[PDB]
């Protein structure tokens, strides 16, 4: 398992190594933090949904 | 026309009273209100229960 973390690295040489996974070209424009936002964001969103249960009693709901 | 009008209105209200119609009065019979909100306790209707199929 320990040969298994390095299975990529066998089939590069070292200039491949860097230019794959160390010398990323900068770009600096995408929105990262969009995963963040989707998921936290997320709950208003089911809250929307939830809210709109056709549950009878009030305090099934609560 | 006195007469003939209380013999009216004596029917009027008795066709009125007929219809469901929504409470216009504040208070019925008793000085309570006739609303959905005036229902206090004694206490005795259960959980409401959902639809049939
Ligand atoms: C044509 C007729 C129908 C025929 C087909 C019938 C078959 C249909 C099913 C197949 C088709 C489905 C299509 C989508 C594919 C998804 C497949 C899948 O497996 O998803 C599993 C899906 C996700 O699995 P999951 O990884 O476990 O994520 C849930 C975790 O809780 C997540 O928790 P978390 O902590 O990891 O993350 C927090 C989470 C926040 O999550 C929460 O906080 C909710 C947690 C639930 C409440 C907490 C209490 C837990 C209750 C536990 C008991 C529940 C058991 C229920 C089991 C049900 C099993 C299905 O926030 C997020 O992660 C991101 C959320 C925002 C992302 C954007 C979401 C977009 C959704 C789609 C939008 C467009 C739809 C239209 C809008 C709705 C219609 C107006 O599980 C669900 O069932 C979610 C249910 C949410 C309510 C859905 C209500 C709407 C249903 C839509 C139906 C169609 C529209 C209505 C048509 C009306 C006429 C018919
Ligand atoms: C009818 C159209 C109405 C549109 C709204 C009217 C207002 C218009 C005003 C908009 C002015 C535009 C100014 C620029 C806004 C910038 C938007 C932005 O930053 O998005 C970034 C980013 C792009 O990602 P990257 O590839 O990493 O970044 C590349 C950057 N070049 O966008 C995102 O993160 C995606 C999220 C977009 C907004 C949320 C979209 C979901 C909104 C929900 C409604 C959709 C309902 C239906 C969805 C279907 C679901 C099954």
Do not use: C
């Not at chain 1, 040969?3 to 990262?32: G, K």
């Not at chain 1, 989707?38 to 709109?52: C, D, M, P, V």
């Not at chain 2, 019925?28 to 209100?33: L, S």
Request: aromatic letters at 14%; proline letters at 8%; glycine letters at 6%.
């Amino acid at each position: 398992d320990f040969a298994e973390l390095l299975r990529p690295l066998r089939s590069l040489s070292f200039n491949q190594v860097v230019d794959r996974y160390v010398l990323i070209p900068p770009n600096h424009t995408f929105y990262r933090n969009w995963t963040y936002e989707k998921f936290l964001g997320g709950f208003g969103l089911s809250y929307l949904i939830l809210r709109e249960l056709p549950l009878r009693n009030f305090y099934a709901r609560v | 026309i006195e007469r003939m009008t209380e013999i009216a209105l004596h029917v009027f209200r008795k066709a009125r009273a007929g219809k469901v119609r929504p409470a216009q009065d504040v208070r019925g019979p008793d000085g309570n209100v006739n609303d959905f909100l005036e229902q206090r306790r004694p206490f005795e209707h259960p959980n409401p229960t959902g639809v049939t199929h």
